[PDB]
């Protein structure tokens, strides 16, 4: 049988992203729109800085900007926490430690509003170096592929996750961003608590040639794996 949350993701779903941010007192807001196709694990999103120039590099916000759109293969359907929490949703909390620099703390509420999947985010950054790779905009506008290993936190009726992102620096080096996360359902009903597995991500960043506002176009594919003798 198909899960109630699963049913909400069988076709293409419109997405709205809203972020309010404050990094070392630099305040900004970002809106994003696009669509998700969970069957293919596909996200297509365009983000616009609605308050001017973004004070941090766009790539540092990629992980923050809807894991309910991951492709979970049929054989892993009983392990899809993110969809099972829908439509009431889930709260994602992260701390992102930039090595030799500051940290972001994020809180995201992911839920449906009608037919639209909404990702509403508050981001707070502190202890950044005003001349570091983040506030000094020294990161390349690109993105590497990463695996994210996931684990149940049954006592919290949720999941706990940690993973490392490597952002390319303009001098050929790398800026590590170490992510620690907890996801918790908003509703009081049952969710699917997964066995250990991972999500495989690939991300491509681009620009809209006709867009004059500060912005980012993101194409991202996300696939679950790591849990599998029929052959």
UniProtKB/Swiss-Prot annotation:
Keyword Oxidoreductase listed: no
PTM description: Contains a chromophore consisting of modified amino acid residues. Maturation of the chromophore requires nothing other than molecular oxygen.
Effect of residue 147 to K: Increases fluorescence at warmer temperatures such as 37 degrees Celsius. In Esmerald; leads to brighter fluorescence. In VisGreen; leads to brighter fluorescence
Effect ascribed to mutating residue 145 to P: Increases fluorescence at warmer temperatures such as 37 degrees Celsius
Mutagenesis / variant outcome for changing residue 169 to L: In R10-3; matures to the red-emitting state with excitation and emission maxima at 555 and 585 nm, respectively
Any GO BP annotation: generation of precursor metabolites and energy
Impact noted for substituting residue 174 to A: In mut2.1; shifts fluorescence lifetime from 3.03 to 2.50 ns
Impact reported for residue 66 to L: In EYFP; leads to yellow fluorescence, folds faster and more efficiently at 37 degrees Celsius and has superior solubility and brightness
Effect ascribed to mutating residue 31 to R: In mut1.28; shifts fluorescence lifetime from 3.03 to 2.76 ns. In mut2.2; shifts fluorescence lifetime from 3.03 to 1.94 ns. In mut3.3; shifts fluorescence lifetime from 3.03 to 1.88 ns
Biotechnology: Green fluorescent protein has been engineered to produce a vast number of variously colored mutants, fusion proteins, and biosensors. Further generation of mutants led to more stable proteins (at 37 degrees Celsius for example) with brighter fluorescence and longer fluorescence lifetimes.
Effect of residue 66 to N: In R10-3; matures to the red-emitting state with excitation and emission maxima at 555 and 585 nm, respectively
Tissue: Photocytes.
UniProt-reported outcome of changing residue 78 to R: In Azurite; shifts the excitation and emission spectra to shorter wavelengths and increases quantum yields compared to BFP
Impact reported for residue 196 to I: In mut2.1; shifts fluorescence lifetime from 3.03 to 2.50 ns
Keywords linked to the UniProt accession: Chromophore, Luminescence, Photoprotein
General function of this protein: Energy-transfer acceptor. Its role is to transduce the blue chemiluminescence of the protein aequorin into green fluorescent light by energy transfer. Fluoresces in vivo upon receiving energy from the Ca(2+)-activated photoprotein aequorin.
Family, as annotated: Belongs to the GFP family.
Protein name per the record: Green fluorescent protein
Organism (species): Aequorea victoria
Gene field: GFP
């Amino acid at each position: 049988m198909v899960s109630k949350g699963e049913e909400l993701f069988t076709g293409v779903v419109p997405i709205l992203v809203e972020l309010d941010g404050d990094v070392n007192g630099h305040k900004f807001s970002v809106s994003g729109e696009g669509e998700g196709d969970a069957t293919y694990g596909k996200l297509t999103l365009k983000f616009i800085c609605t308050t001017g120039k973004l004070p941090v590099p766009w790539p540092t916000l990629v992980t923050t900007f809807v894991q309910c759109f991951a492709r979970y293969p049929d054989h892993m359907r009983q392990h899809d926490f993110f969809k099972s929490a829908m439509p009431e949703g889930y709260v994602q909390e992260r701390t992102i430690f930039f090595k030799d620099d500051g940290n972001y703390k994020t809180r995201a509420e992911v839920k449906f509003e009608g037919d639209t999947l909404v990702n509403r985010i508050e981001l707070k950054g502190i202890d950044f170096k005003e001349d570091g790779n983040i506030l000094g905009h020294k990161l390349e506008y690109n993105y590497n592929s990463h695996n994210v290993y996931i684990m149940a936190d049954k006592q919290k009726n949720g999941i706990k996750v940690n993973f490392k992102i490597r952002h390319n620096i303009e001098d050929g080096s790398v800026q590590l961003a170490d992510h620690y996360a907890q996801n918790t359902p908003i509703g009081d009903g049952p969710v699917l608590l997964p066995d250990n597995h991972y999500l495989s991500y690939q991300s491509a960043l681009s620009k809209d040639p006709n867009e004059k506002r500060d912005h980012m176009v993101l194409l991202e594919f996300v696939t679950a794996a790591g849990i599998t003798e029929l052959y």
